[PDB]
Each structure stands twice: as structure tokens, then as C-alpha cells.
Amino acid sequence: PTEFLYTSKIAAISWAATGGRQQRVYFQDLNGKIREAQRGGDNPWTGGSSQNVIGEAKLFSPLAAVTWKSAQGIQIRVYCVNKDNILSEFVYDGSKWITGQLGSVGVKVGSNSKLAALQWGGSESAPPNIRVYYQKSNGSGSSIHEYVWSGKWTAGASFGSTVPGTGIGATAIGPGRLRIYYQATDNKIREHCWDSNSWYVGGFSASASAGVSIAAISWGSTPNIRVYWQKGREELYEAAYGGSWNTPGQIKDASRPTPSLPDTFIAANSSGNIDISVFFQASGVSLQQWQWISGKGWSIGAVVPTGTPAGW
Amino acid sequence: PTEFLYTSKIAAISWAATGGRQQRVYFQDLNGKIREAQRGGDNPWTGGSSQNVIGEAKLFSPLAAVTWKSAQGIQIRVYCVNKDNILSEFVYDGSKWITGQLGSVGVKVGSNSKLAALQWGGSESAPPNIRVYYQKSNGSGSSIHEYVWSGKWTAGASFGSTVPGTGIGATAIGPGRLRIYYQATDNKIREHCWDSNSWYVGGFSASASAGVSIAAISWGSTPNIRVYWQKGREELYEAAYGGSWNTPGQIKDASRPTPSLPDTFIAANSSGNIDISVFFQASGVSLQQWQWISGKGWSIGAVVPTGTPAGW
Numbered sequence: 375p376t377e378f379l380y381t382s383k384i385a386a387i388s389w390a391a392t393g394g395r396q397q398r399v400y401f402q403d404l405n406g407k408i409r410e411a412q413r414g415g416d417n418p419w420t421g422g423s424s425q426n427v428i429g430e431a432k433l434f435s436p437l438a439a440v441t442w443k444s445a446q447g448i449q450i451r452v453y454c455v456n457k458d459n460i461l462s463e464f465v466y467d468g469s470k471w472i473t474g475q476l477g478s479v480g481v482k483v484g485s486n487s488k489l490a491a492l493q494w495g496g497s498e499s500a501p502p503n504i505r506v507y508y509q510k511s512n513g514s515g516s517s518i519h520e521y522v523w524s525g526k527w528t529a530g531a532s533f534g535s536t537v538p539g540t541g542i543g544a545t546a547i548g549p550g551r552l553r554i555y556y557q558a559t560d561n562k563i564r565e566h567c568w569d570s571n572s573w574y575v576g577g578f579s580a581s582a583s584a585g586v587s588i589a590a591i592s593w594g595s596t597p598n599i600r601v602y603w604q605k606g607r608e609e610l611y612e613a614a615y616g617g618s619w620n621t622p623g624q625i626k627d628a629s630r631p632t633p634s635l636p637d638t639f640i641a642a643n644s645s646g647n648i649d650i651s652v653f654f655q656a657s658g659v660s661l662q663q664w665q666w667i668s669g670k671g672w673s674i675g676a677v678v679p680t681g682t683p684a685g686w
Numbered sequence: 687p688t689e690f691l692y693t694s695k696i697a698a699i700s701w702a703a704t705g706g707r708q709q710r711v712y713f714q715d716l717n718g719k720i721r722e723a724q725r726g727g728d729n730p731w732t733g734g735s736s737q738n739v740i741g742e743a744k745l746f747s748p749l750a751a752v753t754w755k756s757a758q759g760i761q762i763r764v765y766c767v768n769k770d771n772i773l774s775e776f777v778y779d780g781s782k783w784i785t786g787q788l789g790s791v792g793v794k795v796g797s798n799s800k801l802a803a804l805q806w807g808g809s810e811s812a813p814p815n816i817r818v819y820y821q822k823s824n825g826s827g828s829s830i831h832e833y834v835w836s837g838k839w840t841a842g843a844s845f846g847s848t849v850p851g852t853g854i855g856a857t858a859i860g861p862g863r864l865r866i867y868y869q870a871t872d873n874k875i876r877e878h879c880w881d882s883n884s885w886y887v888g889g890f891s892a893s894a895s896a897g898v899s900i901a902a903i904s905w906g907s908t909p910n911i912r913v914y915w916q917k918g919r920e921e922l923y924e925a926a927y928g929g930s931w932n933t934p935g936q937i938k939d940a941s942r943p944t945p946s947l948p949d950t951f952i953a954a955n956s957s958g959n960i961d962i963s964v965f966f967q968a969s970g971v972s973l974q975q976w977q978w979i980s981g982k983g984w985s986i987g988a989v990v991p992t993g994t995p996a997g998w
């Protein structure tokens with residue numbers, strides 16, 4: 375057994391670095407603490423132990439994370455909610471982990487809400503633009519809300535009509551161009567877009583089982599977008615945009631059918647041009663990842679350490 | 687979500703009482719604490735909350751329980767192991783919960799061992815005879831060991847060759863007549879018997895998937911024996927002895943296929959003539975039970991409350 379909480383939400387980030395791709399994954403342990411596991415290049419994953427706790431959140435708290443490089447160093451922001459369902463934030467300021475200012479704003483989230491976050495613009499010479507998505511209620515038909523950070527936290531828009539506690543995928547395909555993916559009341563995955571002026575319904579759409587966990591990444595000049603969704607104990611689906619949308623297909627391994635456990639969630643990260651990882655929760659309870667190799671394809675990769683309880 | 691630990695072992699007991707069948711179920715929460723849920727007659731299950739903690743054990747600790755009536759009242763003994771894998775015991779002495787003497791004996795259990803216990807002879811006028819079964823090592827081919835209580839704890843026999851961490855079902859079919867069921871290295875469920883002089887291989891045998899959880903109950907003059915086994919996410923199997931053995935068959939509901947989660951365990955209790963319950967862990971994470979009605983048959987019954995974490 376491990377210390378990985380069953381049906382823990384997951385959040386993952388990555389960035390290119392001289393000497394190898396850098397990855398960080400966040401997940402919750404049996405005690406409600408948010409842990410971090412790290413990976414540099416192809417080396418084995420490290421961390422994930424009780425020594426890698428960055429903070430705490432309510433049990434089964436939704437999670438989201440973003441990162442960018444700054445003058446101070448690598449910046450990381452992790453979002454989660456406390457026992458009173460108040461949206462909160464952990465900050466890695468380039469050298470240490472502390473608490474962000476978002477908690478003091480007092481934003482209240484629906485107890486079954488998921489979270490998504492995206493960032494664009496942050497660099498050594500520019501301030502980050504962060505957007506966080508969540509829901510206020512758990513009811514069927516609820517909309518998605520947004521909180522914005524551009525110097526200060528302020529409320530953003532609200533849009534859509536979703537299934538209760540829908541999964542939410544969020545990605546910045548370009549400066550100021552945002553794509554949000556969620557599951558509508560009819561169970562179809564829908565897309566919402568922001569190109570400049572307002573939010574409008576995008577053209578993408580696909581049927582999926584009710585309650586899938588959703589993730590989205592993007593890259594390049596085209597730009598390229600990958601939307602992933604998965605119902606626990608079912609196979610992972612991928613929709614790919616490379617100028618236009620293909621037909622969603624499954625990412626699987628014939629020798630390891632439906633490796634995820636029921637009711638679990640996924641997360642995805644990307645960097646370079648192009649590296650992609652999709653994380654899921656499998657028997658163990660273990661934290662696993664599908665890895666992509668341009669040209670070759672998808673394969674289940676290295677297992678992420680999530681601790682070992684005393685007595686084992 | 688709930689506070690029921692995923693892949694927690696389960697232990698269950700019951701006894702006939704004027705005014706309705708009494709049941710108690712023991713399971714582990716996210717904090718490693720052993721909780722108790724109770725049921726009287728057909729009324730809804732009660733307990734299972736943080737207020738119903740009877741003790742603590744290592745995370746994912748094996749569990750077993752026995753009960754008998756005495757002059758002092760209802761006697762309950764719960765077995766589990768601590769973080770150093772030392773077999774320990776919680777005692778309900780008729781009015782309160784305390785710690786038993788078995789822990790001080792220092793018996794060390796294999797970390798992946800399961801536990802089984804049986805009792806016979808205890809009443810208002812007679813002392814109980816308790817036997818506890820466990821394994822010392824996790825290796826393939828390991829044997830089963832026994833600890834005996836007849837006035838004092840002393841080591842008993844050792845027998846069999848099993849799959850690593852085999853499930854163990856134990857039952858006293860009559861005074862001094864014991865039946866132990868486990869899974870042998872060939873994956874077949876085997877039976878060991880003690881009628882008076884020594885332990886010998888019983889005639890029962892049945893194929894099963896590797897790693898099934900096993901439970902056994904018995905009653906009457908014949909006597910009647912029921913052996914249950916289940917691989918998580920598969921259907922529950924029952925072998926019945928009513929003088930001779932039938933062919934093992936499945937206990938299922940067409941409208942709710944394989945309701946248990948992967949890698950979970952079961953427990954069973956019985957009382958009267960005859961009431962039977964088989965507990966399993968389902969999505970939720972919830973504690974459920976199959977219930978038997980003589981003549982009518984099996985059905986999934988009431989859900990056992992296992993708490994609600996803060997923030998939900």
C-alpha cells in the first residue's frame with residue numbers, strides 16, 4: 375500500500391530546462407496534505423514522501439497548478455480549498471513555499487467543484503496573467519466561474535451549463551487566447567473560447583461518459599491543442615487539434631487494459647516541442663503516467679513514488 | 687466521499703437478541719483508527735463516525751473479531767496489528783472498550799498477513815476458547831500459524847502452504863471442531879480440519895482467482911457451513927455444506943454487476959437460524975452488505991455509514 379489518497383485529485387506542470395525536462399506533480403496523502411514529486415530528464419521520479427509536503431487542504435480537495443519563469447526563479451502556484459471550501463493558494467516564489475493572497479479574498483467553492491488554472495505572459499521581464507476556474511454550486515446546469523489575477527485578484531466571467539462537478543480543462547493557446555473544456559448537461563465535452571473581446575462557444579464537441587475527468591494542453595504556432603478525458607476504469611481519450619480537430623481516439627496498451635481505478639482523476643502537463651505526460655491513479659494505490667514520444671507514440675512510463683505507511 | 691479507508695480490511699459479528707438480531711462491523715478510517723458501526727433488527731445502521739473509534743492500528747491492518755455472551759454482558763474481542771506488526775487486541779468487557787493482554791505477548795505478524803479468529807464455549811457459566819490465525823512471513827508457500835487462548839495465550843499449531851498473504855476464513859462448527867479455509871499455492875481454496883486429535887487436510891476444494899478475500903460461517907446440528915470468497919470487482923462466490931458440499935456458485939444482482947472495488951476485502955457474520963450478512967467495499971467509498979433471507983434469497987441491503995470528511 376501507499377500514502378496516496380484514493381480518488382485524490384492530481385495537478386501537474388513541466389518546463390524545458392538546460393539538461394532535461396523538469397516535471398512536478400501534486401497529489402493528496404491520507405492525512406489531507408498536498409505532496410510534490412519531481413522529475414528531471416529521464417531520471418527516476420523523486421519526492422512524494424511526507425518530507426515533500428507543501429501544504430494542506432480539505433480531504434479530496436480539487437487541485438490545479440501553473441508555473442512560469444521569473445527574475446526570482448521558477449514560480450509555481452498551486453490551488454486547492456480548505457475545510458470551509460475557501461479557494462486558497464500555495465506559492466513557490468523561486469526559493470521557498472509560502473501561502474498566497476488568494477485565500478484572504480474569501481472565494482467560496484461548491485464542495486464538489488473541480489479546479490483549473492492557466493497562466494500566460496509571465497517571464498523575467500513581465501508579470502503573469504493567471505486565471506482560475508471553479509464552480510459555486512454542485513447542481514446540474516451550474517456554470518463555470520473565473521477569478522483573475524493581473525496585479526490583484528478580481529472576479530472574472532461566468533459561463534456554460536454543466537453536469538454537477540464537471541471536470542475542467544484550461545489552456546492558454548496564445549497570449550490572451552484561452553480555451554476551456556468541460557462537460558455539458560448532455561454529457562458532451564464542449565469548448566469555450568476567449569480570443570479578445572468576449573467568451574463564445576467554440577466549435578469543438580465530443581460525446582463522453584458522464585463524469586469524466588478532463589485535462590488540456592497546447593503548444594506551438596499553429597497552435598496545437600490536446601484535450602484528454604477519462605472515466606475511471608475506462609480507457610483514456612484524446613482529441614487533437616493541429617489546425618483543425620481530428621476524431622477523438624483512445625490511448626491504450628493491449629497488455630494493460632483500463633489501468634485506472636474507478637472514480638479517479640487525471641492531470642496532464644507539456645513542455646518543449648513536444649513532451650506530454652498524462653497522470654492517473656492505478657491499483658497500488660499508485661500514481662502512474664502515460665508518456666508521449668513524438669513519432670513513436672504513447673506508453674505507460676515510470677511510477678511516481680507516493681510514500682509507504684509505517685508497518686509496511 | 688467518506689472516511690472509509692480504501693482497501694481497509696473488515697470484520698463483522700452478530701448474535702441473536704430478544705427484540706432483533708444485533709450486528710457490529712469494524713473497519714478502518716483515513717486516520718488509521720478502527721471504527722464500529724452497529725445494527726439492531728431491521729433498523730438503520732448507526733455509528734461508523736469518529737465518535738465510534740474503539741482503537742487504532744497500523745494503516746491497512748488486518749482485522750478479525752469474535753463475540754460471546756457472559757455473566758458480565760456481551761464480550762467482544764477485536765484483533766489487529768500495530769505499526770511494528772505486533773498482533774494486538776481490543777476488548778469490549780460487557781460495558782467498556784479497553785486493551786487486551788495479547789499485545790504484551792509480542793507476537794509478530796508478516797506485514798501482508800491477514801487475520802482470522804474463532805471462539806467456542808464461552809457463556810455465562812463457561813470460559814471462552816479463542817483461536818487466532820495469522821502468518822509470519824509474506825512469502826509464497828508460507829504456512830498459517832495459530833495462537834490459543836484457554837486461560838492464557840500460548841502458541842498453537844502451524845499448517846498449510848499458501849499464496850502470499852492468503853485470505854483466511856475460520857469457523858467453529860461444533861465444540862472443539864474447527865474449519866479453516868485459505869488459498870493454496872495453486873490458487874485453490876483448501877480446507878484444514880481439527881475434529882479432536884490433530885489438523886488434517888479436509889476434503890473441500892475449489893478453484894478461485896488468485897488473491898481472493900475469504901470468509902466462513904457455520905450453524906446448526908448438521909452442521910451447515912458457508913464459505914465465501916471474492917476478488918475485488920468480481921462477483922461473490924459461495925460454497926455451501928449442508929451435510930455435503932454443493933458446487934460453488936455466484937451471489938449477484940443483474941442490475942448491479944460486480945459492485946465491489948478492486949483489491950478490497952469482505953467479512954461475514956451469522957446468527958439465529960439463520961441470518962447471514964456479507965460485507966464488501968464499494969464505490970463511495972462505501973461499506974455495503976449482501977443480506978440473506980432464508981427461502982427468498984440474496985439481496986444488497988442497507989448501506990453502513992462510514993463518516994463524512996469536513997468540507998463535504
Ligand SMILES: C[C@@H]1O[C@H](O)[C@@H](O)[C@H](O)[C@@H]1O
Pocket residue numbers: 398410412448450466
Ligand atoms: C521548482 C522547485 O524545484 C525544487 O527542486 C523543488 O524542491 C521545489 O519544491 C520546487 O518544485
Ligand SMILES: C[C@@H]1O[C@H](O)[C@@H](O)[C@H](O)[C@@H]1O
Pocket residue numbers: 451463465473474475476502523
Ligand atoms: C502572482 C501573484 O503572486 C503572489 O505572490 C501571490 O500571493 C498572488 O496571489 C499571485 O499568485
Ligand SMILES: C[C@@H]1O[C@H](O)[C@@H](O)[C@H](O)[C@@H]1O
Pocket residue numbers: 710722724760762778
Ligand atoms: C456490544 C456493545 O453494544 C453497544 O451498543 C456498543 O455501543 C458497544 O460499542 C458494543 O458494541
Ligand SMILES: C[C@@H]1O[C@H](O)[C@@H](O)[C@H](O)[C@@H]1O
Pocket residue numbers: 763775777785786787788814835
Ligand atoms: C478472554 C480473555 O479476556 C481478557 O480480558 C483479555 O485480556 C485476554 O487477552 C483474552 O481475550
Ligand SMILES: [Cl-]
Pocket residue numbers: 430431432454455456457462463
Ligand atoms: Cl487550503
Ligand SMILES: [Cl-]
Pocket residue numbers: 388389390644645646
Ligand atoms: Cl516550456
Ligand SMILES: [Cl-]
Pocket residue numbers: 742743744766767768769774775
Ligand atoms: Cl495495535
Ligand SMILES: [Cl-]
Pocket residue numbers: 700701702956957958
Ligand atoms: Cl446466536
Ligand SMILES: [Hg+2]
Pocket residue numbers: 429430431432453454455456462463
Ligand atoms: Hg489548500
Ligand SMILES: [Hg+2]
Pocket residue numbers: 566567575576577
Ligand atoms: Hg474557438
Ligand SMILES: [Hg+2]
Pocket residue numbers: 741742743744765766767768774775
Ligand atoms: Hg490494533
Ligand SMILES: [Hg+2]
Pocket residue numbers: 878879887888889
Ligand atoms: Hg474435515
